Amino acid sequence: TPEEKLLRAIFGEKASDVKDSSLRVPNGVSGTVIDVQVFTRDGVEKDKRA
Amino acid sequence: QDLVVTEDDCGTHEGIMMTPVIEGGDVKEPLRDRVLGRVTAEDVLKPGTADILVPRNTLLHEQWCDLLEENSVDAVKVRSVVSCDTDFGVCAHCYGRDLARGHIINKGEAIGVIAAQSIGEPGTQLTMSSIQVKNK
Amino acid sequence: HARSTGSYSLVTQQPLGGKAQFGGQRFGEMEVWALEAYGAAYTLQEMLTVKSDDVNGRTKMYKNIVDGNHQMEPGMPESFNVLLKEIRSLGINIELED
Amino acid sequence: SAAVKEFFGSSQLSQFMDQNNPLSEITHKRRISALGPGGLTRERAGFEV
Amino acid sequence: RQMLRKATIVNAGSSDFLEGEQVEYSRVKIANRELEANGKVGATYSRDLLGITKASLATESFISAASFQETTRVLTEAAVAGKRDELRGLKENVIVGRLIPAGTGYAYHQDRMRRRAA
Amino acid sequence: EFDAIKIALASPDMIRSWSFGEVKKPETINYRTFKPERDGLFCARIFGPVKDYECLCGKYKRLKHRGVICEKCGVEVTQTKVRRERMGHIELASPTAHIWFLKSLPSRIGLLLDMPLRDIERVLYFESYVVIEGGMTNLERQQILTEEQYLDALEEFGDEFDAKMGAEAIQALLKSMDLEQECEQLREELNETNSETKRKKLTKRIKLLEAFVQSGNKPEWMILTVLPVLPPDLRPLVPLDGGRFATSDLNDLYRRVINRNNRLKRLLDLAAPDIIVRNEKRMLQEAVDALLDNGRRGRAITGSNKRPLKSLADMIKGKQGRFRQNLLGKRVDYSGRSVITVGPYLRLHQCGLPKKMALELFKPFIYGKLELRGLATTIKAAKKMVEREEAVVWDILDEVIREHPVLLNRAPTLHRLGIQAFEPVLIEGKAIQLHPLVCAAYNADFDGDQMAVHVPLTLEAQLEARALMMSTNNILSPANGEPIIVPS
Amino acid sequence: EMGTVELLTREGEIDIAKRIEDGINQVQCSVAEYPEAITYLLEQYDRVEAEEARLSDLITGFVDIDPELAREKFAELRAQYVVTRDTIKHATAQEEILKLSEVFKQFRLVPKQFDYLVNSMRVMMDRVRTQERLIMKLCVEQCKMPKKNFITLFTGNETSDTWFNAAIAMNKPWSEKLHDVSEEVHRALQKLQQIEEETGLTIEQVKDINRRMSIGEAKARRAKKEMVEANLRLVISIAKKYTNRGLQFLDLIQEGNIGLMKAVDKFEYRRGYKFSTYATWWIRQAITRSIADQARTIRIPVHMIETINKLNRISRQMLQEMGREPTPEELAERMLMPEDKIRKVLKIAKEPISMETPIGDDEDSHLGDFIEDTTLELPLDSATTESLRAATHDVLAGLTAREAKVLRMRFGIDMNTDYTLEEVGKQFDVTRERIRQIEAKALRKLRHPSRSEVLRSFLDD
DNA sequence: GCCTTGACCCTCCCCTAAGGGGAGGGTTTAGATTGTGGTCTGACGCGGCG
DNA sequence: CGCCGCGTCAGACTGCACAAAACCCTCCCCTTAGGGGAGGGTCAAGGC
RNA sequence: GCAGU
Ligand SMILES: [Mg+2]
Ligand SMILES: [Zn+2]
Ligand SMILES: [Zn+2]
């Protein structure tokens, strides 16, 4: 909208092309991460964690 | 659902003759818990006639019922919603008392939903030769 | 589980189902009879319009609660517009007169 | 494979195992059920069955 | 009272009813009143006892009846009858999201029907 | 705003006046790019733009020019919300009987024509003829004929008389009939009839005919020549996140109708034999009748799960229809739920409300009190403060619940004391603390029962919770005048 | 209704096909009675001598492709047109015309150029019927009289209003009222008679040609009906093999019926092959094309349908030979397509779930009431937008009205559109780069932490 | 000793036109193929046959 | 009148886990060049 | 479907 367009014009913080869709702990849940499994489709290059 | 108390009085003179519920030999509901809260439809008078015990259009609260059991009156003609002259609703006199508050009912009370809930709430508590006079 | 606002349903604009979808409690039919047995006409009306379905009305309600003004401007619930459009998709002309 | 697959995965009698404690499993395996394909429907079963 | 809510005309009188048709009892009562006010003798009727289902489905408001059960029959009868529903009870005002005509919404409806009448 | 809801039959002119264009093709969307296809069941040109203030070719993209019909694609530039309001239509190549006015007993087409429903279902399933005009011939106006009897009548009488089959014939019979004349004739033969059964049949037919002449309806509107198309946002085709789509059964039924209709137009152009076009007219009739009410005539259509398709009539009726599931009761914002425990320290007007439930139920109240008291400069700052749960939002939360009642409800709400208001006392648990004396009113024991909490927002709602529903006003029962807030 | 038609023998199909062929070549002779069609045949014959189009879709052969028959025997028809063009000197010309017909007997014609010819003939038909209906309801909208008295004088005149001299002789007021019509038929009554001799033949006898055409064409279409209605069992026997592949049973048999009508009007019996072997090809084509087109909610093209079918067949054989579902990186090497094409094909082939699908066999719930509306705006974001409007309005009220309106005018603030510098240059009576500097002035002014402390909280963290 | 208004030149960005290629719709095939596939509910009201 | 066939109905809230092919032809999308426009960089004049 | 009230 024009107001946040002006807001971008004043401060200069250009919005990013990506949206945060990360996995977060559900609210109220508190615990320890005890296992992480990464399943990668064949052909996709594995990250350092995989 | 659409039965609301919409008037203060329809001026009718009809009403049911409330009597105690006597199934055979014993009473199951006295006159007191049957007329408590109604308004009378006619002048209740003592068994000795010509002196009106309770006046015509009176709400029978607990003091008036105590007066009805001091004397021995056993049939009181009260006003009911089946005999209300009000069209599209019910007058506040033909209903009687609002049982939750204890006074005559206000204009605007949704008495049909209250009646339907009050009947169908106990529904889960329901299921699925010669005569010998007992006393004097 | 509790919600103030959140995700709403797609066809009808009512809140979603359960605490996994951030919920909203079904104020069903017997509870509407409970609010009709009291004279709670405004509580009932705000349960119908500006908490479930009045799409222009629930945003106004939020901005009024935030701006310190506990007042509603209820409109027609969107489920009733869905109903008028689904009756008209049969060969039946249902209307609103004035 | 589709017949066997739909029976084992999506039948009414092939149920997600109740795995709370050992007793839950050992009594979910000894379960008998009048419902299911070829059985009753819980809404149309009278007081006598 | 809500069960014995209809009547059948046995004598049409000086009125716009037919013998053997089931009319709302309040309608025929007020029609007889406004006829007797002008000297013409009104209709005579016999009250009917309907069940709570057959009386719920026989209301003069098709929104309540279509909302209750047998939506298809009620909607076809109301369509071919060219019916009109004035939102007078509680369910038709809950369906459309209005104040109910009972309780704290009774003053609002008295204002609304005394200012949309004159 | 409005004072009444009038229901009537929809003229084909009325059906064409609602619609914003004809759905000529069964295309829902394009498979490569999920833009909706032209002249289809989801058509941005017919049903409105799929995005806010943006035509489907992207040539016009802002509300600088709104209300503009683009020329590269015919999409108006307006809100996408109009896809919930804009209907379309289908021009049926053959007149099709409405299933509601044919099959819901007593049959209105049958009751109106004085014709048994077996005869009408045989005429409009192309199993018999019917003589829509007798002329100077012994053939009467409701006389059904077999195929060979019609051939014999054509031998003996030629092209003088008129006889047809299918819903075209029923429509010609409903159109040719005179309503006031037949009504007064039935009144005459009701005044001279003493058979009570015939008097009952005659008076119900007379009330039907006079209900038609008093309303604006015409009888032949019971035979659909135009069919409405629901707005596509009410039968949505939405992509699930897993790449797969999810559609309503209405798209399958509409797509079936349009396929059979376009094939009927094809056959009528190809001059196909009468066996094929009769079978196609029967299929179009049964597809429209499966769209309106599935399973009402014979076998229900089941698609791709071997489960019957949900028709238009099934959307609005039953325990899962709109009327009972979305209009008389509905899911509600500002509502929470938790287990109930005793809290015998409470007063009759108090409940115990968890701090983590009351911080969510009263979120805009806390946002507004953080904005007002200067503790937050914005609603985004106040949202972050409530999210981090600073020590000041708990003081704000103690401020905003002070005299603010909440309604507590234990379903099944058997009577009106199954919803009562209480002032919340912030407790640290996760379970509601319900006063002991009110338990008998709720039929609530603390063996796992849960209760929903609702927040009354407006000043009227708060004052009804305080004046009408508060548990101190509820100490007598409304069924009998006896106490219900009673020791136990 | 279908079993009440008896099947055909091998010789019955021959008889029906010969009835069809006799109907169509006699109706083609009936349009050959119209010699403008002869002129068109001969001018496209000279264009064949220039090879405007190919001969196979000009001619299919000749009955008692080789092109040298057509050239010289169309020259023979040209000599026949020569001997009929001038040999009228009108009682001796009436033999050469049916000689034209039965020397045209040996001709075969294609569907499409004959479709051009019959659309010209239907223009002729529409002209004839609209002129005769002009004659019909130009007088009866003026008069009230049974018009058989006026048709009895019309048939045969065809040149002028000499048949109107005895119209008034009845002296019953109809021809009195026809007085006022006796003029305005003028440019009608001659103009048809113009083209009458441009096509050479009289309006009444070309009406006879039109009705003989209608008789012959209904004779052809009657026998096209018997061949379709007899082979309707073949459509069912074929369509029962496609039953659960996306369409209903009746939809399949109706599309196969369309294919069978196509086979019937594309069948010729002179090849000596049985009709069922031809109709089977056409019915298979129609039914599979219908399944490819209208069996899916999100319709995919017929080439992608063929691709998905080949993929399913190949994966079926691979599963049968190696006992497991093949990976797309071996399914792509048993086929010869790239692996990402196999991946997108496998992503395409899925059908949409119904939103009334119950979740975990739970009937009171469905798939439809877990799907949220993502296009909505959160009311916190609506409150954020209205608060940002208020904050921006105040922090631009803290400026000079000129530059504050420059900013409200350059962005879309309080206005339906935003304006570029030239627009406002025409508006503010100021050159472009000066008001550009004014905008930069106000932006540098608002970047200060004096006023921009509330606005910065509208930026994310 | 320091601020506007142009002034000229420079730089990049978005709309437009065209060309290649993938895509998608279309037409045609000629040995004979001739009619497809759960039942587990009881009570109540009604309406047409007989 | 008896009877058979048919239509309508059967509590409310919560979680949990969840779902033939081959060849022709035109048409639309991706890519790229271009051109116009729309800001951006660095100064020349009085004015402040 | 499986549980809770
Ligand atoms: Mg309990
Ligand atoms: Zn009264
Ligand atoms: Zn556009």
Distance CA F287, CA F293 (A): 10
- For residue G216, give both structure tokens: 């012959």
Handedness of CA F226, F232, F236, F241 (dihedral sign): positive
Distance C90 CA to H35 C1' (A): 36
Q: What is the DSSP string of F344-356?
A: TT--TTEEEEEHH
Q: How far are the Cα atoms of G77, G190, G207 from residue G121, in angstroms, in the given order?
A: 21, 20, 12
Give the number of other Cβ atoms within 10 Å of residue F335's Cβ.
26
Q: Are C14 and C80 in contact (CB under 8 A)?
A: no
Residue F436: closest CA among F341, F353, F355, F357: F341
Distance CA F333, CA F457 (A): 11
Q: What is the DSSP string of B38-104?
A: -BBSS-EE-SSSSSEEE-TT-B--HHHHHHHHHTT---EEE--GGG---SSSEEHHHH-B-TTTSSB
Q: Are F469 and F421 in contact (CB under 8 A)?
A: yes
Architecture of the CATH domain G376-457: Orthogonal Bundle (1.10)
By 3-state DSSP, what share of chain E in percent is helix, strand and coil, each rounded to 5? 45, 15, 40
Residue F355: closest CA among F405, F408, F411, F396: F396
Element (H, E) at B5: strand B5-7
Distance CA C24, CA F245 (A): 26
Structure-determination technique: cryo-EM
Q: Residue E4: list chain B partners with CB under 8 A.
A: 82
**What CATH code would you report for G295-375?**
1.10.10.10
D–F contact: 3+ Cβ pairs < 8 A: no
Which residues touch G390 (CB under 8 Å, ≥6 apart)?
A: none
In chain G, which segments carry CATH 1.10.10.10? Answer: 295-375, 376-457
Give the number of other Cβ atoms within 10 Å of residue G297's Cβ.
22
Residue F59 sits at the vertex; the CA angle it makes with F56 and F61, to the nearest 5 degrees, is: 80
Residue F144 half-sphere exposure toward CB, CA atoms < 13 A: 19
Q: Residue ranges of the alpha helices (H) in G266-369? A: 275-294, 302-322, 328-334, 339-348
Is residue G188 packed enough to be buried (19+ CB in 10 Å), middle (13-18) or exposed (0-12)?
middle
Q: How far are the Cα atoms of B135, C34, F419 from residue F79, in angstroms, in the given order?
A: 85, 39, 40
Is residue B49 packed enough to be buried (19+ CB in 10 Å), middle (13-18) or exposed (0-12)?
exposed
Q: Residue C39: list chain B partners with CB under 8 A.
A: 108-110
Q: What is the DSSP string of G250-277?
A: HHHHHHHHHHHHHHHHT--GGG---HHH
Q: Which of residues 418-437 of G touch strand H (CB under 7 A)?
A: 430-431, 433-434, 437
Distance CA G417, CA G419 (A): 7
Distance CA F427, CA F299 (A): 58
Residue E97: closest CA among C83, C49, C85: C49
> Which residue reads 């504050």 in tokens?
G404
Burial A10-37 (b: 16+ CB within 10 A, else e): bbeeeeeeeeeeeeeeeeeeeeeeeeee
Residue E69 to chain F, least CA–CA distance (Å): 7
**Three-state DSSP class for residue F119:** helix
**Three-state DSSP class for residue F184:** helix
Residue F90: closest CA among F254, F211, F219, F251: F254
Q: What is the DSSP string of F274-324?
A: HHHHHHHHHHHHHHHHHHHSTTSSSSPPB-SSSSB---HHHHHSSTTSHII
Looking at residue F235, the DSSP 8-state letter turns out to be S
Which residues touch F361 (CB under 8 Å, ≥6 apart)?
A: C2, C3, C4, F334, F335, F336, F406, F453, F455
Q: Which CATH class is domain G1-51+65-294?
A: mainly alpha
> Which residue reads 């440019």 in tokens?
G187
Give the number of other Cβ atoms within 10 Å of residue E116's Cβ.
9
Q: Are G281 and G259 in contact (CB under 8 A)?
A: no
Distance CA E102, CA E94 (A): 11
Strands B90-91 and B5-7: parallel
Q: How far are the Cα atoms of F261, G291, G333, G340 from residue G311, in angstroms, in the given order?
A: 33, 17, 11, 13
Q: How far are the Cα atoms of B55, E4, E33, E48, G209 from residue B83, in angstroms, in the given order?
A: 20, 11, 17, 15, 88
Residue F212 sits at the vertex; the CA angle it makes with F206 and F213, to the nearest 5 degrees, is: 90
Distance CA G123, CA G210 (A): 11
Q: In what side-by-side order are the strands of the sheet with E22-24?
A: E22-24, E6-11, E44-47
- Give the max Cα distance, chain E: 44
Which phi and psi (to 5°) does residue B88 adopt?
55, 60
**Three-state DSSP class for residue G206:** helix
- Nucleotide at minimal C1' distance from the G112 CA: H27
Which phi and psi (to 5°) does residue B108 adopt?
120, -10
Distance CA F293, CA E73 (A): 12
The Å distance, Cα F54 to ligand 3 centre, comes to: 7
E103 contact B CB<8A = yes
Distance CA F163, CA F141 (A): 9
Indicate the length of chain B as a whole number.
Answer: 136
- For residue F279, give both structure tokens: 């079978």
Residue F253: closest CA among F305, F280, F292, F296: F292
- For residue F275, give both structure tokens: 């066996």
Cα-to-chain-centroid distance, residue E48:
15
Which residues touch G301 (CB under 8 Å, ≥6 apart)?
A: G292
**Three-state DSSP class for residue E45:** strand
**Three-state DSSP class for residue G158:** coil
Cα-to-chain-centroid distance, residue F293:
13
Q: Are D17 and D28 in contact (CB under 8 A)?
A: yes
Which are the residues after which chain G is interrupted (C to N > 2.5 Å)? 64, 89
**Three-state DSSP class for residue F85:** coil
C–E contact: 3+ Cβ pairs < 8 A: yes
Distance CA E23, CA E25 (A): 6
Distance CA F274, CA B109 (A): 66
Distance CA G247, CA F426 (A): 61
> Which residue reads 């019922």 in tokens?
B65
Element (H, E) at G195: helix G186-198
Strands F406-409 and F335-341: unpaired
Give the number of other Cβ atoms within 10 Å of residue G289's Cβ.
15
Q: Which of residues 141-200 of F touch strand I (CB under 7 A)?
A: none
Q: How far are the Cα atoms of D42, E27, E30, E93, F329 from residue E87, in angstroms, in the given order?
A: 39, 17, 20, 6, 18
Q: Is the CB of F403 under 7 A from strand J?
A: no
Give the number of other Cβ atoms within 10 Å of residue F427's Cβ.
19
Q: What is the DSSP string of G77-139?
A: HHHHHHHHHSTT---STTTHHHHHHHHHTTB---HHHHHHHHHHHHHHHHHHHHHHHHHHHHH
Distance CA F20, CA F17 (A): 8
Q: Are F113 and F101 in contact (CB under 8 A)?
A: no
- Nucleotide at minimal C1' distance from the D18 CA: J2
Which are the residues after which chain B is interrupted (C to N > 2.5 Å)? 128
Which phi and psi (to 5°) does residue G231 adopt?
-95, 20
Residue G121: closest CA among G50, G46, G35, G202: G35
Q: How far are the Cα atoms of B38, B71, E93 from residue B60, in angstroms, in the given order?
A: 6, 15, 35
Burial B52-65 (b: 16+ CB within 10 A, else e): ebbeeeebbeeebb
Which residues touch G344 (CB under 8 Å, ≥6 apart)?
A: none
| Amino acid in position F250 | L
> Which residue reads 């002006």 in tokens?
A6
Indicate the length of chain C as a whole number.
Answer: 98
Residue F319, phi-psi category: left (phi > 0), alpha (psi -120 to 50), beta (remainder): alpha
In chain G, which segments carry CATH 1.10.601.10? Answer: 1-51+65-294
Q: Would you call E95 and F208 a contact, using CB atoms and an 8 Å cutoff? A: no
Distance CA G221, CA B43 (A): 96
> Which residue reads 């395996």 in tokens?
D29
Q: Would you call F481 and B36 a contact, using CB atoms and an 8 Å cutoff? A: yes
Distance CA B88, CA B2 (A): 8
Which phi and psi (to 5°) does residue C49 adopt?
-85, -65
Looking at residue B28, the DSSP 8-state letter turns out to be E
Q: Are C24 and C3 in contact (CB under 8 A)?
A: yes
- For residue G435, give both structure tokens: 């008001």
Q: In what side-by-side order are the strands of the sheet with F5-9?
A: C92-94, F5-9, E84-85
The Å distance, Cα F373 to ligand 2 centre, comes to: 55
Distance F287 CA to I20 C1' (A): 31
Distance CA F170, CA F113 (A): 9
Residue F443, phi-psi category: left (phi > 0), alpha (psi -120 to 50), beta (remainder): left
Q: Are G260 and G232 in contact (CB under 8 A)?
A: yes
Q: Are F41 and F232 in contact (CB under 8 A)?
A: yes
Residue C18: closest CA among B48, G369, G43, A44: G369
Q: Are F405 and F462 in contact (CB under 8 A)?
A: yes
**Three-state DSSP class for residue G217:** helix
| Resolution as reported, in Å | 2.7
The residue lying closest to nucleotide H7, measuring its CA against C1', is G433
Across the strands, what pairs with G317? none
Q: How far are the Cα atoms of C7, D21, F58, F79, G422 from residue G375, in angstroms, in the given order?
A: 10, 44, 18, 12, 36
Distance CA E23, CA C2 (A): 50
Q: Are F21 and F46 in contact (CB under 8 A)?
A: yes
- For residue G56, give both structure tokens: 């196979």
Cα first-last separation, chain F? 51
- For residue F402, give both structure tokens: 């002070």
Residue F297: closest CA among F39, F98, F64: F98
Distance CA F282, CA F126 (A): 8
- For residue E12, give both structure tokens: 């049409």
Best residue in B36, B106, B118 for a mutation probing chain F (most F CBs within 10 Å): B118
Cα-to-chain-centroid distance, residue G13:
31
Q: Residue A3: list chain G partners with CB under 8 A.
A: 385, 388-389, 392, 411, 413
Looking at residue F327, the DSSP 8-state letter turns out to be I
Looking at residue B18, the DSSP 8-state letter turns out to be E
